[PDB]
Design an enzyme around this catalytic site. Structure first.
Site, PDB file in Angstrom:
ATOM      1  N   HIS A 131       0.829  -1.198   0.000  1.00 56.22           N
ATOM      2  CA  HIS A 131       0.000   0.000   0.000  1.00 56.22           C
ATOM      3  C   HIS A 131       0.866   1.251   0.000  1.00 56.22           C
ATOM      4  O   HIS A 131       0.804   2.074   0.919  1.00 56.22           O
ATOM      5  CB  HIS A 131      -0.943   0.007   1.199  1.00 56.22           C
ATOM      6  CG  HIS A 131      -2.100   0.952   1.058  1.00 56.22           C
ATOM      7  ND1 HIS A 131      -3.329   0.699   1.618  1.00 56.22           N
ATOM      8  CD2 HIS A 131      -2.206   2.151   0.440  1.00 56.22           C
ATOM      9  CE1 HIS A 131      -4.148   1.699   1.358  1.00 56.22           C
ATOM     10  NE2 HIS A 131      -3.490   2.597   0.641  1.00 56.22           N
ATOM     11  N   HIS A 134      -7.253  13.542   1.920  1.00 55.61           N
ATOM     12  CA  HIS A 134      -8.273  13.496   0.873  1.00 55.61           C
ATOM     13  C   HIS A 134      -8.750  14.826   0.292  1.00 55.61           C
ATOM     14  O   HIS A 134      -9.765  14.866  -0.415  1.00 55.61           O
ATOM     15  CB  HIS A 134      -9.452  12.648   1.342  1.00 55.61           C
ATOM     16  CG  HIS A 134      -9.070  11.241   1.677  1.00 55.61           C
ATOM     17  ND1 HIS A 134      -8.716  10.321   0.713  1.00 55.61           N
ATOM     18  CD2 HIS A 134      -8.947  10.610   2.868  1.00 55.61           C
ATOM     19  CE1 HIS A 134      -8.393   9.179   1.299  1.00 55.61           C
ATOM     20  NE2 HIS A 134      -8.523   9.330   2.602  1.00 55.61           N
ATOM     21  N   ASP A 179     -12.177   8.277  -4.461  1.00 55.22           N
ATOM     22  CA  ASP A 179     -11.864   9.644  -4.892  1.00 55.22           C
ATOM     23  C   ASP A 179     -11.962   9.780  -6.409  1.00 55.22           C
ATOM     24  O   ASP A 179     -12.111  10.881  -6.923  1.00 55.22           O
ATOM     25  CB  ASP A 179     -10.485  10.076  -4.392  1.00 55.22           C
ATOM     26  CG  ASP A 179     -10.441  10.272  -2.886  1.00 55.22           C
ATOM     27  OD1 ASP A 179     -11.427   9.916  -2.195  1.00 55.22           O
ATOM     28  OD2 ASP A 179      -9.419  10.788  -2.385  1.00 55.22           O
ATOM     29  N   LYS A 199      -5.900  -0.019  -8.930  1.00 59.47           N
ATOM     30  CA  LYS A 199      -6.485   0.494  -7.705  1.00 59.47           C
ATOM     31  C   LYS A 199      -7.841   1.134  -7.981  1.00 59.47           C
ATOM     32  O   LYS A 199      -7.965   1.970  -8.881  1.00 59.47           O
ATOM     33  CB  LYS A 199      -5.554   1.528  -7.072  1.00 59.47           C
ATOM     34  CG  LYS A 199      -6.152   2.301  -5.895  1.00 59.47           C
ATOM     35  CD  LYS A 199      -6.495   1.381  -4.726  1.00 59.47           C
ATOM     36  CE  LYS A 199      -6.925   2.146  -3.481  1.00 59.47           C
ATOM     37  NZ  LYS A 199      -5.866   3.017  -2.960  1.00 59.47           N
ATOM     38  N   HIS A 206       2.050   4.889  -1.577  1.00 63.54           N
ATOM     39  CA  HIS A 206       1.638   6.073  -2.325  1.00 63.54           C
ATOM     40  C   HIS A 206       2.986   6.654  -2.731  1.00 63.54           C
ATOM     41  O   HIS A 206       3.740   7.080  -1.859  1.00 63.54           O
ATOM     42  CB  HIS A 206       0.940   7.086  -1.411  1.00 63.54           C
ATOM     43  CG  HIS A 206      -0.510   6.811  -1.208  1.00 63.54           C
ATOM     44  ND1 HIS A 206      -1.493   7.466  -1.911  1.00 63.54           N
ATOM     45  CD2 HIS A 206      -1.148   5.938  -0.394  1.00 63.54           C
ATOM     46  CE1 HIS A 206      -2.673   7.021  -1.538  1.00 63.54           C
ATOM     47  NE2 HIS A 206      -2.496   6.092  -0.616  1.00 63.54           N
ATOM     48  N   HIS A 218     -10.752   0.494  -2.429  1.00 70.39           N
ATOM     49  CA  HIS A 218     -11.030   1.499  -1.412  1.00 70.39           C
ATOM     50  C   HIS A 218     -12.454   1.847  -1.831  1.00 70.39           C
ATOM     51  O   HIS A 218     -12.664   2.607  -2.776  1.00 70.39           O
ATOM     52  CB  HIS A 218     -10.121   2.727  -1.522  1.00 70.39           C
ATOM     53  CG  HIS A 218     -10.551   3.880  -0.657  1.00 70.39           C
ATOM     54  ND1 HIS A 218      -9.652   4.735  -0.055  1.00 70.39           N
ATOM     55  CD2 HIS A 218     -11.781   4.333  -0.315  1.00 70.39           C
ATOM     56  CE1 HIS A 218     -10.307   5.666   0.615  1.00 70.39           C
ATOM     57  NE2 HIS A 218     -11.601   5.443   0.473  1.00 70.39           N
ATOM     58  N   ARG A 260     -15.916   8.072   9.350  1.00 63.67           N
ATOM     59  CA  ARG A 260     -14.862   7.092   9.077  1.00 63.67           C
ATOM     60  C   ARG A 260     -14.053   6.707  10.317  1.00 63.67           C
ATOM     61  O   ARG A 260     -13.398   5.666  10.339  1.00 63.67           O
ATOM     62  CB  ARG A 260     -13.923   7.646   8.009  1.00 63.67           C
ATOM     63  CG  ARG A 260     -14.398   7.392   6.604  1.00 63.67           C
ATOM     64  CD  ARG A 260     -13.593   8.192   5.610  1.00 63.67           C
ATOM     65  NE  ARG A 260     -12.179   7.831   5.586  1.00 63.67           N
ATOM     66  CZ  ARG A 260     -11.354   8.140   4.588  1.00 63.67           C
ATOM     67  NH1 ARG A 260     -11.801   8.805   3.530  1.00 63.67           N
ATOM     68  NH2 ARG A 260     -10.071   7.826   4.668  1.00 63.67           N
ATOM     69  N   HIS A 280      -7.173  -1.272   3.908  1.00 64.27           N
ATOM     70  CA  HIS A 280      -7.688  -0.771   5.188  1.00 64.27           C
ATOM     71  C   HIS A 280      -9.127  -1.171   5.461  1.00 64.27           C
ATOM     72  O   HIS A 280     -10.008  -0.308   5.597  1.00 64.27           O
ATOM     73  CB  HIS A 280      -7.562   0.761   5.236  1.00 64.27           C
ATOM     74  CG  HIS A 280      -8.034   1.454   3.988  1.00 64.27           C
ATOM     75  ND1 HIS A 280      -9.348   1.440   3.583  1.00 64.27           N
ATOM     76  CD2 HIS A 280      -7.349   2.121   3.026  1.00 64.27           C
ATOM     77  CE1 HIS A 280      -9.453   2.054   2.416  1.00 64.27           C
ATOM     78  NE2 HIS A 280      -8.257   2.476   2.058  1.00 64.27           N
ATOM     79  N   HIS A 312     -10.429   3.448  -6.371  1.00 64.07           N
ATOM     80  CA  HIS A 312     -10.494   4.389  -5.267  1.00 64.07           C
ATOM     81  C   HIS A 312     -11.744   5.251  -5.344  1.00 64.07           C
ATOM     82  O   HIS A 312     -12.102   5.736  -6.415  1.00 64.07           O
ATOM     83  CB  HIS A 312      -9.254   5.274  -5.300  1.00 64.07           C
ATOM     84  CG  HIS A 312      -8.921   5.895  -3.986  1.00 64.07           C
ATOM     85  ND1 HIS A 312      -9.651   6.930  -3.445  1.00 64.07           N
ATOM     86  CD2 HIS A 312      -7.923   5.639  -3.111  1.00 64.07           C
ATOM     87  CE1 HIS A 312      -9.116   7.285  -2.289  1.00 64.07           C
ATOM     88  NE2 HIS A 312      -8.065   6.518  -2.065  1.00 64.07           N
ATOM     89  N   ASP A 361       0.222   2.691   3.879  1.00 63.06           N
ATOM     90  CA  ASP A 361      -0.655   3.712   3.292  1.00 63.06           C
ATOM     91  C   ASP A 361       0.228   4.964   3.411  1.00 63.06           C
ATOM     92  O   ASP A 361      -0.213   6.023   3.847  1.00 63.06           O
ATOM     93  CB  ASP A 361      -1.966   3.884   4.079  1.00 63.06           C
ATOM     94  CG  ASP A 361      -3.066   4.580   3.277  1.00 63.06           C
ATOM     95  OD1 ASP A 361      -2.816   5.041   2.145  1.00 63.06           O
ATOM     96  OD2 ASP A 361      -4.205   4.657   3.784  1.00 63.06           O
TER      97      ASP A 361
HETATM   98 NI    NI Z   1      -7.649   4.221   0.755  1.00 69.15          NI
HETATM   99 NI    NI Z   2      -3.916   4.858   0.385  1.00 73.88          NI
END
Ligand code: NI
Ligand code: NI
Ligand code: NI
Ligand code: NI
Ligand code: NI
Ligand code: NI
Lengths: 100, 101, 566, 566, 566, 100
Positions: free
Chosen positions: C133, C319, C220, C216, C135, C245, C335, C271, C218, C359
């Protein structure tokens, strides 16, 4: 010592704060980098002492006042964030509007 | 609490079990000290050490791996030897065997 | 002759029956087996065993190992044993008894003129960690992770850009190509994840064909049923993994809708507890399914007194949420739940959660995956006692269950277990040597592909390597061409066949992913539990078979203030 | 629906009519235009606009951009506008409205699965700076300049050698080849200058054929009429630029003799004010001619209270002069004149001086080209008020005139404007993102060829990228092969044809210079004034059309003590 | 006209008859010759001599040098003279008089447009040092050594592994290949040593065929007569050098047995005094033989008040000895003898010991080879006065004898003198420029293959290169491809023929070793004495021709506390 | 100053010791890296003062006691080693069991 990259990185912050500390002591109004370094170093020591994240989020807003820094500086720092090893591991302390 | 501490169970470890051994009296006739390692082919040690080299053929010191026995000048002492294993081929040292045995 | 057990331990490290404390935790491991022949242990140094004709033989390079780790205490998912480790051609050659067959018995790892020696007596050796995980916000993360004991990093990103700050996505062929090229400069094995949020298959196939080993999904970028189905369809045909996610906002549906969209297809849920993202408040119920490989990110591991307090602002920055926008702050709060955070630790102890990850810099700490995993094990032993599977008066089973979380399980989940993930013959020699007092915190040596890549190093001008200041510095394995030869860039089967490595002129060794679609929960080593888990919509209480799952927050943790300067 | 202007600005940055203060100066810019459709702005983050089927479309990589900078406030020589910026293949694709054509109107920059996002709302975006007066004394200068916002560096040198300490010259084929090879390791676009001081043409042609994009005529190597004529003759036939540092000593003639030797041929005059070198005391009169492209080095910008005091010793060390040798100190003093230093600022405000540069570590500060340029603009607004060209209640025109000094004008002068110099479609994506409070001082992101190369980065192990300490660190765009793909090495047309790149095995992208002979003063954007300027031989007073040109020294400047730790 | 000698020295540096103090020692050197023509010296700077038509000519690149070091005071084994140094194609072109033949007399080094200038007036220039006892424990050692003035490093290792901690061995083809590849990343010339401890020739031939330029026989791997004979037999057939660390334990025989095993074949004896390893207590008697090339490691140089005290624990860590094991501590003590440590200094002064080396991080300091060599010379002058060979009132001969110890002699011993080792035409341009006040301590400039590789550098953003903080930083010669072109990787003749460079894809220039078997003690420049030396078995007293050899320990040394911050 | 890599490396040790020094002053029990840095920096200054290696090997064992450091720390530091420029050049100081 077996210092990891992150420990060595924090030594840079600590040293930057020593600079600010001495200038504040002389009676100078701190600038942007000096203010950020001083408040940040304060929080790191708080964590070493064993203070909670909640306590520091509050205490951090009382390190420097608007009259101890240059004009515009309080507005250039909407918040300050720093992590340190608390008794319960690494935690993030976010101090909103530290200078008032 | 001690970080990474050991909790060794009491007792002793028997080394090189089930192998032929022999005792030999050795004497350092040289004027300088001589120290021999655990796995050195005893029959080919420094020529100044006087003993029955014939009996020590294919043997090494019966001591824990990595340790040694020191002989100061003029020192005489009895040591216990243990026979080599594996292919029982000796190569190196003073180049006296350079082959099996 | 004879030697006392204590003196023996001091010289060659512990043996069968001896116990060792892991760092400053309450976890104790007991040596289960010892592959040596007492009296024939190999030791290097002045006047020691590894010398010509003695512990070192006369064989050519082809008939001996390049490197031997002597008297190592191995801790892996398969056992905790004492043995010598042989490495040849950058890979694990054998786990057994090293020496010279000419004069020593039971030699399985021959030492010759071409053999280098690493003294592991009194040290613990483990496989390198695998963080799935990542980034890619900055390249500096690789050194931080390597220093912690992680040798493989899977994730996505293009640098400090908004998209990468929030998601593990390397968007499109151009950025993918660029990041694959940049990867040659980093001292860790790397695999990339593309942006899987699209409802047009060809846009996904292009990314896979360009080099990503996974996609991935996500929220977002829109974690809708349509996007999810599209990504899984492509994953099924190209043998790559999907990381999810989910839709925290419950905008397109609830957790049951997402699960239905997945339709029993293999997927790695990031997660799974929820704080890092996912259907509020029940994304955690995903660990009950056979096709779900669940992992945790590290800031919620383990549940402590300061955990909740630090999460809100962390969530916002990660985010791009606006604290002045009520809806933004309301969804950040939904969350963060004490109830699911506390349950997560227990679920790990039970084997319901199978992996730990970071993460990195997006609600996670890159250098704390291993450290936090062991802190959870400690807190769980302290609170729940011995596991039902434990045998003997030690924590061996709990240790095997937890080490599997950041080594073999992440490898299996992402289709790279044929190359890395554990200390088994044929696998890349990514090894980490630890001193018991610093286990999981600060390694003594980090080996990549058979070469030491980073280690603590004292004064460069000193007469010995030990004088202060001692801090981590890059070694030969992290230098230019030697690095390329000791690291792996993982590609999809399609990219490998398309000649992507030749086209981009990649210098490092190439490895291909496979078996991403066939892994299921039952395949996770020591962590295959599928509990009948429920989450109360109102109270957020987590229950398994009706029983409440929970734990208490720690005020102080091991592997913390005793080791770090800051 | 409806939204207040303030709330709007807080979410998407300012729009038409809003004004923004540049750092802590007195300069205010007003948004002239906004290319968006109100209500259709793209925003990225949790539950935002850029998501599958919404702000993100279903197109393949070929039909969408690789990167989009959302809601950017562009400041360039052509305008100060609000718009989205699309980057594709490392180049500027379009300036317009980004989004998904499937559901949004007026989309000119399509966003798809292959698109990365950089949130620029509330930020100012400018082209990367171009410093054409670099002394390659040390490689560390490249990182310093990149961090300041300069992405292209033109100059000469071989390292800390006496010749390079004093002049911007990379002498001969061997050193030129060596420096072109070393250039691949630096994260900035690079072009080299050879030693143009020779009266034998073939010795110059060899250097051009080897790779230099220009020739430096320096008095330390003999700035005689013969050498000047020789260099210009070769420049005219090989399409390369000549940079001049004239004969301060008036040894071979006065300024009128040098000008006569130039004979109306195109030439770039370095530090035209004179302190950095040139005919004493009237080299400044060169800015009156049509064939002269005049620039300033930065230590004299702007005129302040401490300016004069620091110059004498700086002058000596830079030119290897002996303070004990009377003639050496007398010629150092004849170069430092309060009169010309004060006039220079005004001449910049009027557009008589067209470029700003550093003169790195040889009477100039590599990281202060941009910063000092804005300090001059501020001091000029404070002293002279609005420019005759200003329209509206803002400083938009003065801002456009000054930004042109370190972006498009240096590019035009050196024949590289077809590749870099401004934010226009087809040009290399060298962009700098700034937060208004730190404009011109400390950038938020520096993009090279479509990839972020350097940016401020917080704690690597932190849960987010923002925690302290935050300092500039190299990103993926500055790493190995990714760097080679994102930077340019400029060569002369002759070198390009000779296969120099293949022979030296240069890894970076290659660009060729052209149009160096055809540029004239009239071509300098917003800075084409040719004033009837005179300098009094005795008093050193500068006059334009008989009127005295002068200004007052600043005691305090913006972009100074409020931002720097030291 | 006329000029006073003092004023002359201030402008061009000292001339014939002038004396200069080396750092803060008691050593004085006197200029023996000056190759200039008074009045025609070349000087660079504003209005100086090196300018078009004046000191600079009209010749093409092929007919002039790439670099000239003006007015240098050369200190080499062959003389201490004042002259200009010309460098062309990365090699020493000529030592003579630089300038323009068109207007100047006696010009032997032509300066043209393609010539860069380094001002050496008032500076001392020497060849780069050569350390032949490197333990490749970490890559950082290369920068430390380069900064001290050492440009060539010969040794062995694979990183911080037990084998390398104790011995200079790169074991086998795999590790050798890996280290040859990693070598391209380091800014120093490199040659590797393999593990020579085997009684099977083919195991040695493989290593030589793989790339090593020598074989290290170390007691930690078994320094037995059989292993020694085997290594020498292979060395004799492959033209490579053997370095020896004999059997301290006297386990296989005494020093006379080892010498007999060597059988008059050429061999380099490491740390011949014994503290670093060797037959106790008489290994020092080896310097009496014609086939032995003896060197010292640096911690025992020179004998001081704190020398003995620091040795015991240093010894233990370097050889993995256990202080609790009586036999381990007894053998450590038998290696530390005040008697042999004191005699060693005198033997160096007499020329019985021919080389100085470090033994980097394994009982030696990598950055102190040069520094300690000069401290010995100082202490010897102070104690013994002038050498029998001295002529005039200076220390010229002692200086030539000592500089040969870390330059030409190590080069001869290892078969690389055809490439490096001294300032002679045709040799690689590895030069070190020093300011007299810092001679041997901190260099002003370190040149590798014609390019400056490292030098002190001040504030990067400053107006000049001199402002604080000034510290050593890598220059262009240490960057990527420029580095590859300016450094050498030495290979054995067999490896060169086998195409090892092509196979491993080595990027740097390749050089082959030769003449390792034919060098003997008589070939060591200024250090060819073969004394009738004896060591008393009981008292350890060293005697030459019956006379006792000894010296007194220093309480304070030059080149120490006056220069270092720590 | 012309600082070599080793001089700059020692600046890191000195700074690490400043951190420890301030914490000891507050009355905190030092952790592993803090203890190593404090004792090491002490020895470096001893060498600058001109003390012998023998004297420092002894004095170094009296900088911190078992009651001034956290549990387990004394056992994590079997010895401390550091080099510094003594009047007679660089020398190695090894302090065995510094904390008791
Ligand atoms: Ni995530
Ligand atoms: Ni992440
Ligand atoms: Ni100039
Ligand atoms: Ni200049
Ligand atoms: Ni040795
Ligand atoms: Ni050695």
């Amino acid at each position: 010592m077996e210092l990891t990259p992150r420990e060595k990185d924090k030594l840079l912050l600590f040293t930057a704060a020593l600079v600010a500390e001495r200038r504040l002591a002389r009676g100078l109004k701190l600038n942007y980098p000096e203010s950020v370094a001083l408040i940040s170093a304060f929080i790191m020591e708080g964590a070493r002492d064993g203070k909670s994240v909640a306590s520091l989020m509050e205490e951090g807003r009382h390190v420097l006042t608007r009259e101890q820094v240059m004009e515009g500086v309080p507005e250039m720092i909407p918040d300050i964030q720093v992590e340190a090893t608390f008794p319960d591991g690494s935690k993030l302390v976010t101090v909103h509007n530290p200078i008032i | 609490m001690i970080p990474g501490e050991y909790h060794v169970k009491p007792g002793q470890i028997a080394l090189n079990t089930g192998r032929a051994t022999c005792r030999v009296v050795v004497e350092n006739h040289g004027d300088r000290p001589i120290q021999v390692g655990s796995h050195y082919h005893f029959a080919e040690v420094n020529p100044a050490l006087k003993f029955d080299r014939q009996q020590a053929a294919g043997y090494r010191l019966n001591i824990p791996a990595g340790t040694a026995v020191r002989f100061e000048p003029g020192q005489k002492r009895e040591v216990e030897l243990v026979a080599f294993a594996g292919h029982r081929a000796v190569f190196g040292f003073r180049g006296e065997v350079m082959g099996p045995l | 002759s004879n030697i006392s057990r204590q003196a023996y331990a001091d010289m060659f490290g512990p043996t069968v029956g001896d116990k060792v404390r892991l760092a400053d935790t309450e976890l104790w491991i007991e040596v289960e087996d010892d592959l040596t022949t007492y009296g024939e242990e190999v030791k290097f140094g002045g006047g020691k065993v590894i010398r010509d004709g003695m512990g070192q033989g006369q064989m050519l390079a082809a008939d001996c190992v390049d490197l031997v780790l002597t008297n190592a205490l191995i801790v892996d998912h398969w056992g905790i044993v004492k043995a010598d480790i042989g490495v040849k051609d950058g890979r694990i050659f054998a786990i057994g008894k090293a020496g010279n067959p000419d004069i020593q018995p039971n030699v399985t790892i021959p030492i010759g003129a071409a053999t280098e020696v690493i003294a592991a007596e009194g040290k613990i050796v483990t496989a390198g960690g695998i963080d799935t995980h990542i980034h890619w916000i900055c390249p500096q993360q690789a050194e931080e992770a390597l220093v912690s004991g992680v040798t493989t990093m899977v994730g996505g990103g293009t640098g400090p850009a908004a998209g990468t700050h929030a998601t593990t996505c390397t968007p499109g062929p151009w950025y993918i190509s660029r990041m694959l090229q940049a990867a040659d400069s980093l001292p860790v094995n790397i695999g990339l994840l593309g942006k899987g949020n699209v409802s047009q298959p060809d846009a996904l196939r292009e990314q896979v064909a360009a080099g990503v080993i996974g996609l991935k999904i996500h929220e977002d970028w829109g974690a809708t049923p349509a996007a999810i189905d599209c990504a899984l369809t492509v994953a099924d045909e190209m043998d790559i993994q999907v990381a999810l996610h989910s839709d925290t906002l419950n905008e397109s549906g609830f957790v049951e809708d997402t699960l239905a969209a997945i339709g029993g297809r293999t997927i790695h849920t990031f997660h799974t507890e929820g704080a890092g993202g996912g259907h509020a408040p029940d994304i955690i119920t995903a660990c009950a399914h056979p096709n779900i490989l669940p992992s945790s990110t590290n800031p919620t591991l383990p549940y402590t007194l300061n955990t909740i307090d630090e999460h809100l602002d962390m969530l916002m920055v990660a985010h791009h949420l606006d604290p002045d926008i009520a809806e933004d702050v309301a969804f950040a709060e939904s969350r963060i739940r004490r109830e699911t955070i506390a349950a997560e630790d227990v679920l790990h102890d039970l084997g319901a959660f199978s992996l730990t990850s970071s993460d990195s810099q997006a609600m996670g700490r890159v250098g704390e995956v291993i450290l936090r995993t062991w802190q959870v094990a400690h807190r769980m032993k302290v609170q729940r006692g011995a596991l039902a599977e434990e045998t003997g008066d030690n924590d061996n089973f709990r240790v095997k269950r937890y080490i599997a979380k950041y080594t073999i399980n992440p490898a299996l989940t992402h289709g790279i277990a044929h190359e890395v993930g554990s200390i088994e013959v044929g696998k890349l020699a990514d090894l980490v040597v630890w001193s018991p007092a610093f286990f999981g915190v600060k390694p003594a040596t980090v080996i990549k592909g058979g070469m030491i890549a980073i280690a603590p190093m004292g004064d460069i001008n000193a007469s010995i390597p030990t004088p202060q200041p001692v801090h981590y510095r890059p070694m030969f394995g992290a230098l230019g061409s030697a690095r390329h030869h000791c690291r792996l860039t993982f590609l999809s089967q399609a990219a490998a066949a398309n000649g992507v490595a030749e086209r981009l002129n990649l210098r490092s060794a190439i490895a291909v992913v496979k078996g991403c679609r066939t892994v299921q929960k039952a395949d996770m080593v020591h962590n295959s539990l599928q509990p009948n888990i429920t989450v109360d919509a109102q109270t957020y209480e987590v229950r398994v078979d009706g029983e409440l799952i929970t734990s208490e927050p720690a005020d102080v943790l091991p592997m913390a203030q005793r080791y770090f300067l800051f």
